[PDB]
Design an enzyme around this catalytic site. Structure first.
Site, PDB file in Angstrom:
ATOM      1  N   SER A 212      -3.426  -5.812   0.936  1.00 42.32           N
ATOM      2  CA  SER A 212      -2.042  -6.080   0.661  1.00 42.32           C
ATOM      3  C   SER A 212      -1.155  -5.220   1.527  1.00 42.32           C
ATOM      4  O   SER A 212      -1.554  -4.152   1.986  1.00 42.32           O
ATOM      5  CB  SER A 212      -1.753  -5.770  -0.805  1.00 42.32           C
ATOM      6  OG  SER A 212      -0.359  -5.718  -1.041  1.00 42.32           O
TER       7      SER A 212
ATOM      8  N   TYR B 149      -1.327  -0.386  -8.336  1.00 37.42           N
ATOM      9  CA  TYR B 149      -1.661  -1.582  -7.579  1.00 37.42           C
ATOM     10  C   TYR B 149      -1.858  -1.279  -6.083  1.00 37.42           C
ATOM     11  O   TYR B 149      -2.897  -1.599  -5.492  1.00 37.42           O
ATOM     12  CB  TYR B 149      -0.552  -2.621  -7.733  1.00 37.42           C
ATOM     13  CG  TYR B 149      -0.838  -3.873  -6.950  1.00 37.42           C
ATOM     14  CD1 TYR B 149      -1.735  -4.825  -7.431  1.00 37.42           C
ATOM     15  CD2 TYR B 149      -0.259  -4.084  -5.694  1.00 37.42           C
ATOM     16  CE1 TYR B 149      -2.055  -5.965  -6.676  1.00 37.42           C
ATOM     17  CE2 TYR B 149      -0.570  -5.214  -4.930  1.00 37.42           C
ATOM     18  CZ  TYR B 149      -1.466  -6.148  -5.422  1.00 37.42           C
ATOM     19  OH  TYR B 149      -1.797  -7.251  -4.670  1.00 37.42           O
TER      20      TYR B 149
END
Ligand SMILES: NC(=O)C1=CN([C@@H]2O[C@H](COP(=O)(O)OP(=O)(O)OC[C@H]3O[C@@H](n4cnc5c(N)ncnc54)[C@H](OP(=O)(O)O)[C@@H]3O)[C@@H](O)[C@H]2O)C=CC1
Ligand SMILES: NC(=O)C1=CN([C@@H]2O[C@H](COP(=O)(O)OP(=O)(O)OC[C@H]3O[C@@H](n4cnc5c(N)ncnc54)[C@H](OP(=O)(O)O)[C@@H]3O)[C@@H](O)[C@H]2O)C=CC1
Ligand SMILES: NC(=O)C1=CN([C@@H]2O[C@H](COP(=O)(O)OP(=O)(O)OC[C@H]3O[C@@H](n4cnc5c(N)ncnc54)[C@H](OP(=O)(O)O)[C@@H]3O)[C@@H](O)[C@H]2O)C=CC1
Ligand SMILES: NC(=O)C1=CN([C@@H]2O[C@H](COP(=O)(O)OP(=O)(O)OC[C@H]3O[C@@H](n4cnc5c(N)ncnc54)[C@H](OP(=O)(O)O)[C@@H]3O)[C@@H](O)[C@H]2O)C=CC1
Ligand SMILES: O=C1OCc2c(Cl)c(Cl)c(Cl)c(Cl)c21
Ligand SMILES: O=C1OCc2c(Cl)c(Cl)c(Cl)c(Cl)c21
EC number: 1.1.1.252
Lengths: 254, 254, 273, 273
Positions: free
Chosen positions: A152, A166
């Site tokens: 990501s 995250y």
């Protein structure tokens, strides 16, 4: 060392006759990776943990496009499931050429509010799960195979508040890719990470702002934007690309 | 916005009257961070999980150098210990200005041989543990405080085989630093990561090769090489440095 | 075993620059002036280089002397390699040695890539890139064994959302690679080479082009600019100042920075650009 | 909602370069020649630029035609901005449009920083950095809306153990920053800008300076060099080839690379340098 690896020309992009396994392929980015890999000639094993009806729907759509597909249930948070999944997988189509580790969950919260249960929930799936999907992939992949992990933009992002858990779970994947590329190279398997920016999926919902704010190209990222890069890496075109992190965010700055 | 933050001149490097807590300070790099912080005027809380005699020895040595010190037992793998440790810590010297998250374990193994228990052992201490030491530090730190996390050259290394677990546990810390710098900035706390190359400690043992191979400067890295950078970050000199990863490896390439 | 020897003093003295001689390019104004002042405050004798700001350079020299440390100005245009060589020779004859070299001189530039002229590209790179490389070449030659070389980069070297800034950004990005490579070469004299990469910092350069990093900020008041820089480029909610940079430079310049080489230290208050 | 529109074709066709027109600088030899050949093999009409290798350039042009695609050579020295402008004008008049621009031309350079001359620094940067920037400026102007610009970098831009390579490495590192910044500017025409950063690749450049990346390899046989490159720079145990690079360039040049912009793709077989 002058011997050309694979075919010269367009065939080097071909995924015809390959067998791919994609984790979390019943929905979102994983579903599109499976669809696109299928469209390019791959037989696809569609993994899911919950979305059973969705999984069979992806499998059916892939068949409708001209390629064989099958689904396998397995929760990446349980290493026993991952081991079982790969054993089942190789028996479905006889071999495994490409492994796309895509399953992941999102999380939000100022560091002060993070509980051990929330931290563990996220790392067990996004980090630990991918590590073990990678371990089993190494074992079952064909010599010359492919392993693509999911990262990501947050792995390197600098302005995303309330996202330490995250982001950190994804940043770890980038180092895994560098390190696993060394280990797995003994079977000629390349290991890379795809790092999407914002992509329209269910996770995403949790358009004009994303369009103008995160991209000079002025549009929203879509699952197919990611699926296409995965296919490149999974092909012979990606043969000299290993241990790399490919950012796929349309020129975003987060 | 033209107001100068802190003193002009050498006093900006002073750690006089500060209170620091260092995790895993009974031995290795953590011990030297504590000694050096003490030498620069800090009262130091020496955390340890096992090395009790070593911990009291560090505390005694720090006192001998002219600064107060005390030890607190706590295992970072248990979030309840971390919460307790900080509660105890602030009561010892009344406040907390600097937190050095240093506790960590090493691990080796080709990805194929990694077990879930080994992966969990390492991530619980190197990653999860640091995250929670960070969470509690945020809560107890003085406005304008300092949080320094422990990373490693392996977070970005490209040629270390059989080190995916360890390296990945450290790479994650780099993203935490970027993300926590945003969250913790609401209390004016800077968050950074120090990433040592090889340093002579017990972990290290597990000299001429390290000297010539990993450094153009041709010497071995020592705990003090790290301790000094930690003191810089912990000082007013480090005020505009936040969300950064400082490599301390003498120009190594791994 | 012989590698167990502790490099330098244990304790606070390791941060001392007492008796050190430093040279700062472009020290008559901005970040360079403050680097010189702060280095002077920590005990260094400073050679204040300047290319145009003569009166400002002597002002910095006088101010440094007032704070209790010797200083002297040397004129040299970093775009002329002959000037740099001459500057280093004059420098070592003023104070006898050179322990620290701070390559700070630089120019800013704005413009969509389509509008960039070869003359504009050449003007910026000759000072920001070529100039720093030759100041570095000469610094290597003249520096004491165990010296320090700090190069000037920028957040733009890695920034991802700065439009109309390819020339300037590229000229600073090159410096990051120079640091990694020069750290190897210069290590044969135990010299450490690092880059300081500031975010926006209040100086003349700041005021001029600040509004060019702010979307539709061309009509911003000076306060709305400072306020925008405060909230937009830093979670710490304040503007970056020349002293924020000077402090890190001194750390790198000291024994504390001994194991720090071939690195880029971002100094932007946690900015995302 | 309107953002739900799928950009380009679903399936294998998204990797197609059929009917595309590409321009490759320095395509008479090495990596550039193979980029041209492979682009030609995937359906592109190619303008083979060269500065000196005329006979080699026509050979590439003839070879591309033999594989079933049109091609033409255009002479231009990337160190002369006037040549680049003229080259792009001649290019669009040969095939009518330009969809892909591959900025490949470059020179290598070795030497301890202390030994670098302003003439050597200038020679390398004028071609590797300044040259690529102006090829990029012109490519922006002439490219089709939705075009592609691929710049040539190197593993050296980020390498940490390459001694006596500051000039060359720095000239390629600058390209990584150009890509990030130009991706912003050029996006107003939907053009994606990326950098391909190869590790060691077997070409003429390779043979000449290969031994300069190998510690005490100045007396290595060609085989011991290839063998050293195989085992030392790649876990995959083989040497990098021009086609390894050409394949990634085609990916970026295709619709598959649509969401890939402002990135640096390392193509070195997992090398650590
Ligand atoms: N969309 C975005 O903006 C971005 C996404 N990513 C990453 O890409 C991946 C896909 O994201 P996206 O498609 O948006 O996500 P969604 O939330 O739409 O669903 C993702 C998938 O994760 C699967 N999954 C969750 N837990 C497990 C588990 N324990 N075992 C097996 N599979 C599991 C889900 O399957 P099931 O239904 O069975 O639970 C689902 O198929 C994720 O890892 C995500 O973090 C990265 C950057 C951006
Ligand atoms: N030395 C090196 O080469 C490098 C080290 N690092 C990192 O720097 C840190 C220090 O390393 P180093 O000093 O060499 O290590 P050592 O192996 O010498 O000891 C490290 C410390 O970790 C502590 N520790 C381990 N587990 C816990 C726990 N559960 N709770 C609290 N403390 C714990 C140990 O304390 P106890 O005795 O009580 O168990 C010890 O004090 C580590 O995080 C390491 O990974 C990074 C790069 C290089
Ligand atoms: N301000 C900011 O936000 C940032 C600045 N930087 C970099 O920091 C450095 C200094 O910045 P800043 O203080 O703001 O700049 P200013 O615009 O205030 O001027 C800085 C110095 O550059 C000197 N200079 C210009 N050309 C030459 C030349 N040809 N030869 C020798 N010296 C020269 C000037 O000398 P003279 O007195 O003769 O005019 C002046 O001393 C630059 O390299 C800049 O790019 C990086 C990031 C951010
Ligand atoms: N080989 C390797 O290991 C690596 C190469 N690279 C980069 O890839 C690119 C090509 O490398 P490679 O093929 O090995 O190089 P070669 O040494 O084989 O030559 C490459 C091309 O550069 C061209 N060229 C040189 N000067 C000019 C100029 N002034 N104007 C226009 N074209 C010029 C040459 O043109 P002409 O025919 O006229 O001589 C030739 O076509 C370069 O930018 C290089 O730095 C990056 C990493 C590794
Ligand atoms: O990198 C830079 O160089 C000069 C500069 C200015 Cl003058 C300003 Cl205002 C800002 Cl925000 C930045 Cl990031 C920079
Ligand atoms: O970056 C490079 O540019 C040219 C080059 C060569 Cl010619 C060789 Cl042999 C190697 Cl190993 C590398 Cl890394 C490079």
């Amino acid at each position: 060392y002058d011997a050309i690896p694979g075919p010269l020309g367009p065939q080097s992009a071909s995924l015809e006759g390959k067998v791919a396994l994609v984790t979390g392929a019943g929905r979102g980015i994983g579903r599109e990776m499976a669809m696109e890999l299928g469209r390019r000639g791959c037989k696809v094993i569609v993994n899911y943990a919950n979305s059973t009806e969705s999984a069979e729907e992806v499998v059916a759509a892939i068949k409708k496009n001209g390629s064989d597909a099958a689904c396998v249930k397995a929760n990446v948070g349980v290493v026993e499931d991952i081991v079982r999944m790969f054993e089942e997988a190789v028996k479905i189509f006889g071999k495994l050429d490409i492994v796309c580790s895509n399953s992941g969950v999102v999380s939000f919260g100022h560091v002060k509010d993070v509980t051990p249960e929330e931290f563990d929930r996220v790392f067990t799936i996004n980090t630990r799960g991918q590590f073990f999907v990678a371990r089993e992939a190494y074992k079952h992949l064909e010599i010359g195979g492919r392993l693509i992990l999911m990262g990501s933009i947050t792995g390197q992002a600098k302005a995303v508040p309330k996202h330490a858990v995250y982001s950190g779970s994804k940043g770890a994947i980038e180092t895994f890719a560098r390190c696993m590329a060394i280990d797995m190279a003994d079977k000629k398997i390349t290991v890379n990470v795809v790092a999407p920016g914002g992509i329209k999926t269910d996770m995403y919902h949790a358009d004009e702002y994303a369009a103008v704010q995160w991209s000079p190209l002025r549009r929203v990222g879509l699952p197919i934007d990611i699926a296409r890069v995965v296919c490149f890496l999974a092909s012979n075109d990606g043969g000299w690309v290993t241990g790399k992190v490919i950012g796929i965010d349309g020129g975003a700055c987060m």
